[PDB]
Design an enzyme around this catalytic site. Structure first.
Site, short mmCIF file in Angstrom:
data_model
loop_
_atom_site.label_atom_id
_atom_site.label_comp_id
_atom_site.label_asym_id
_atom_site.label_seq_id
_atom_site.Cartn_x
_atom_site.Cartn_y
_atom_site.Cartn_z
N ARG A 182 0.89 -2.28 12.26
CA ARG A 182 -0.14 -3.65 11.85
C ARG A 182 -0.95 -2.69 10.23
NH1 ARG A 182 -5.27 -4.39 13.48
NH2 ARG A 182 -4.82 -2.95 14.82
N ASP A 187 11.73 -11.06 -4.02
CA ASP A 187 11.29 -9.51 -3.96
C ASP A 187 9.86 -9.35 -3.24
OD1 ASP A 187 10.23 -6.72 -4.28
OD2 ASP A 187 10.31 -7.15 -6.41
N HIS A 195 12.46 0.89 -7.36
CA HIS A 195 12.69 -0.88 -6.83
C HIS A 195 13.64 -1.09 -6.16
CE1 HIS A 195 10.08 -3.84 -6.31
NE2 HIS A 195 10.67 -5.34 -7.15
N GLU A 235 0.87 -1.14 0.05
CA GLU A 235 0.23 0.06 0.32
C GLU A 235 0.57 0.81 0.19
OE1 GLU A 235 -0.35 2.33 2.50
OE2 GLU A 235 -0.58 0.78 4.71
N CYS A 254 8.45 -1.02 -1.24
CA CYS A 254 8.98 -2.28 -1.82
C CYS A 254 10.60 -1.86 -0.91
CB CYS A 254 10.03 -1.98 -3.37
SG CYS A 254 9.97 -0.25 -3.99
N1 LIG Z 1 7.28 0.60 -4.72
N2 LIG Z 1 8.52 0.26 -5.31
C1 LIG Z 1 8.09 0.94 -6.91
N3 LIG Z 1 8.49 1.74 -7.85
N4 LIG Z 1 8.16 1.85 -9.04
C2 LIG Z 1 7.03 1.46 -9.38
C3 LIG Z 1 6.02 0.19 -8.87
C4 LIG Z 1 5.52 -0.33 -10.03
C5 LIG Z 1 4.16 -1.92 -8.68
C6 LIG Z 1 5.18 -2.05 -7.54
C7 LIG Z 1 5.98 -1.05 -7.37
C8 LIG Z 1 6.62 -0.46 -7.48
#
Ligand SMILES: NNc1nncc2ccccc12
Ligand SMILES: NNc1nncc2ccccc12
Length: 272
Positions: free
Chosen positions: A62, A124, A107, A36, A67
């Protein structure tokens, strides 16, 4: 802190640094802690990537995260258990053609080794929407079937690209270097993607979870349930219903964000 995390993801198995434990941990994590972006959406940056800050949010409060938060937290957990963890940086190319402009490094993924491993593994748990629910062999060419979609790594220039079979074709998800990136570089990337006015995590809402042979993906008011057989799409009626979905279906402590009226109004102005 380790106990709190294991209870949060409802893990009950062994804790030795092995392949089976790594599989069972990734499975438990992806099924329990949602992806989220409620913080960046509400104007709250994701800047603090320490073990204490991420455990406070994703375990004690919670909440879910993105990422940097997901792979940050599991990275600290694996290190404590005896796994060797290297943090990597990636550029997201999902749904983009090969001639698209070079994406920012927003990412982060993990390269993981353990006593007796035949090779390094990609971990991941933070790629919302399409995150692999298994550790993947960090090797090129091999098709790697998971509990959901199959995945494949390929050699692209000076780095690698992760691909996945979505619907009827192989889709490139992200390209990444296997070089270790210092923590400060990850903070710089997380700041950009959580604060920049153009970022998709600032302008819109995204939530994702797995339970358990299906993917629950939310883009604004658009809820999609991806199963092995097919896909069903639900158009959510209002901002109030969107918050309900985030709390119930996605298991996010929405009260942590603040007054529900403010979150609803933000979702209303952005998604509606
Ligand atoms: N939070 N990292 C992320 N950064 N750029 C694009 C993304 C697209 C989908 C999921 C995570 C992503
Ligand atoms: N196994 N091939 C598959 N290809 N696309 C989407 C899928 C979604 C769930 C499970 C399997 C999938």
């Amino acid at each position: 802190d380790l106990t709190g995390y294991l209870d949060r993801i409802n893990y009950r198995g062994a804790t030795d640094p092995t392949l089976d434990v790594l599989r069972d941990l990734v499975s438990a994590h992806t099924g329990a802690i949602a992806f989220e972006n409620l913080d960046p959406l509400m104007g709250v940056p994701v800047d603090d990537l320490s073990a204490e800050a991420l455990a406070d949010k994703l375990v004690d409060r919670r909440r879910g995260g993105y990422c940097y938060e997901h792979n940050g937290l599991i990275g600290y957990v694996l290190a404590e258990l005896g796994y060797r963890v290297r943090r990597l940086a990636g550029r997201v190319v999902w749904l983009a053609p090969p001639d698209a402009p070079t994406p920012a490094q927003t990412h982060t993924v993990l390269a993981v080794t353990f006593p007796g491993c035949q090779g390094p593994y990609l971990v991941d748990v933070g790629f919302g929407g399409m995150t692999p629910t298994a550790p993947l062999r960090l090797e090129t060419g091999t098709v790697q079937q998971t509990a959901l979609e199959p995945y494949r790594l390929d050699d692209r220039g000076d780095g690698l690209v992760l691909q996945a079979m979505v619907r009827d074709e192989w889709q490139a998800l992200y390209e990444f270097s296997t070089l270790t990136r210092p923590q400060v570089d990850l903070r710089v990337g997380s700041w950009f993607v959580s604060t920049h006015p153009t970022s998709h995590f600032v302008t819109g809402l995204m939530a994702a979870t797995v339970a358990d042979d299906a993917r629950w993906n939310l883009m604004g008011r658009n809820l999609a349930i991806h199963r092995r057989g097919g896909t069903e799409k639900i158009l959510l009626e209002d901002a109030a219903a969107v918050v309900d979905t985030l709390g119930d279906r996605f298991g996010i402590n929405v009260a942590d964000v603040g007054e529900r009226g403010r979150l609803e109004a933000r979702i209303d102005k952005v998604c509606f």
